Amino acid sequence: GLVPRGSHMKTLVIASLSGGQGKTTTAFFLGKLLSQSAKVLFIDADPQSNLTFFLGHEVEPSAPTLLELIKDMVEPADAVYSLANSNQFLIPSDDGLSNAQEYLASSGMGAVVLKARLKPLSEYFDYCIIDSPPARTQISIATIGAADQLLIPAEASTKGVNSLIRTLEIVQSLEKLGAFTGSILGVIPFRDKWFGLSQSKDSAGAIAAMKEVAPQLRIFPSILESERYKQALNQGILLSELGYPDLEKPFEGVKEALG
């Protein structure tokens, strides 16, 4: 049973055209951090289902997940599961989430299907954090449509700059069509390589080119390349709890920009 409150749930989406463990990382640590003093709803919109795994949830056989919520086969709240933490909940994903592609496309309003599905939950949480799939897919675009704020991780590399660009053009076209009504929180570069005191010229350049391509956008302190992210993720804890609080700073920065 879900306790309703005075809350008007603010939906944040971590979206980026290309394949990146950057979104899932950013969704995990950012959600966990928001849940310190707020009620947070995680949505795992990637058919790879990592966020669901990292948050330590397993989907039982006849259990309704995101797929069932998208296809209107179940009340929204029946796809919301409680987590270990008392402030964190999860609309999971497993195997067949990709069957949502056909359903969404053929509906003729894919990009706003999820936005609709989640309205009912508006009063029950303070935040919704969506980890979107690593492609242009129907789903990909339904998450963007659902967003009040959009956060775009981008690899500090040429591939990352090109992905930032394709993502902004996808967003713009959804805005023109009326699907995307939110604003863009900013870009958060990731896999930024440093060699002690000097950063990789390649990373410095990509990040410099991000500010050029999108001078209107805010570019957050970046996520250093580091195995720690994967280590904490694996044991389901924050980076500060693992012992490396500096790495947590760029996520703190994002939290502070939502308040």
d(CA 169, CA 177): 13
**Which two three-digit tokens encode residue 258?**
């939502």
State the burial class of residue 242 (Cβ atoms within 10 Å of its Cβ: 0-12, 13-18, 19+). Answer: middle
- Give the DSSP letter string of 212-229: HH-TTS-B---EE--SHH
What is the C-alpha separation between 152 and 130, in angstroms, rounded?
A: 12
From residue 105, alpha-carbon distances to 38, 63, 102, 139, 167 in Å are 34, 24, 5, 9, 19
Name, in order, each residue with C-beta under 8 angstroms of 100's C-beta and a sequence gap of 6 or more: 66, 67, 70, 71, 138, 139
Q: Tell me the resolution in Å.
A: 2.7
DSSP tag of 239: H
Paired with 223 in beta bridges are 190
Domain ranges of the chain: 11-256
What is the distance between the alpha carbons of residues 2 and 121, in angstroms, rounded to a whole number?
9
CA 145/CA 111 separation, integer angstroms: 5
Tell me how long the chain is: 259
Contacts of 19 (CB under 8 A, 6+ apart): 134, 135
The amino acid at 111: A
Taking each continuous run of H as one helix and of E as one strand, the counts in the chain are 11, 10
Contact status, residue 191 vs residue 22, Cβ threshold 8 Å: yes
252 Ramachandran zone, left/alpha/beta (phi>0; psi -120 to 50): alpha
Annotated binding site: 19-25, 48, 155, 159, 190-191, 224-226, 229
Identity (one letter) of the amino acid at 2? L
Neighbours of 205 (CB within 10 A): 15
**And the tokens for 57?**
């949830």
Does residue 186 contact residue 221 with C-beta atoms inside 8 Å? no
CA distance 3 to 124: 6
Q: Tell how far CA 253 is from the center of its chain.
A: 16
Closest CA to 123 of 6, 2, 259: 6
Q: What distance in Å separates the CA atoms of residue 135 and residue 192, rounded to the nearest whole number?
A: 22
d(CA 77, CA 1): 8
Give the containing element (helix H, strand E) for 251.
Answer: helix 249-258
The C-alpha atoms of residue 229 and residue 239 are separated, in whole angstroms, by 7
Q: Which of 112, 147, 124 is nearest to 40 (CA)?
A: 124
User: E strands along the chain, which residues?
Assistant: 10-14, 40-44, 81-82, 88-91, 127-131, 149-155, 183-192, 194-195, 198-199, 223-224
Residues making up the binding site for ATP: 19-25, 48, 155, 159, 190-191, 224-226, 229
Q: Is 237 helix (H, G, I), strand (E, B) or coil?
A: coil
Core vs surface per residue 111-138: b (16+ CB within 10 A) or e: bbbbbebbeebeebbbbbbbbbbbeebb
Beta-carbon contacts of residue 190 (< 8 Å; ≥ 6 apart) = 20, 22, 25, 26, 153, 154, 155, 156, 160, 222, 223, 225
Question: Which residue numbers belong to the known binding site for Mg(2+)?
Answer: 24
Collapse the DSSP code of 129 into the 3-class scheme (helix H, G, I; strand E, B; otherwise coil) and give the result.
strand
Q: CATH: 3.40.190.10, 2.40.50.180, 3.60.15.10, 3.40.50.300. Which one for 11-256?
A: 3.40.50.300
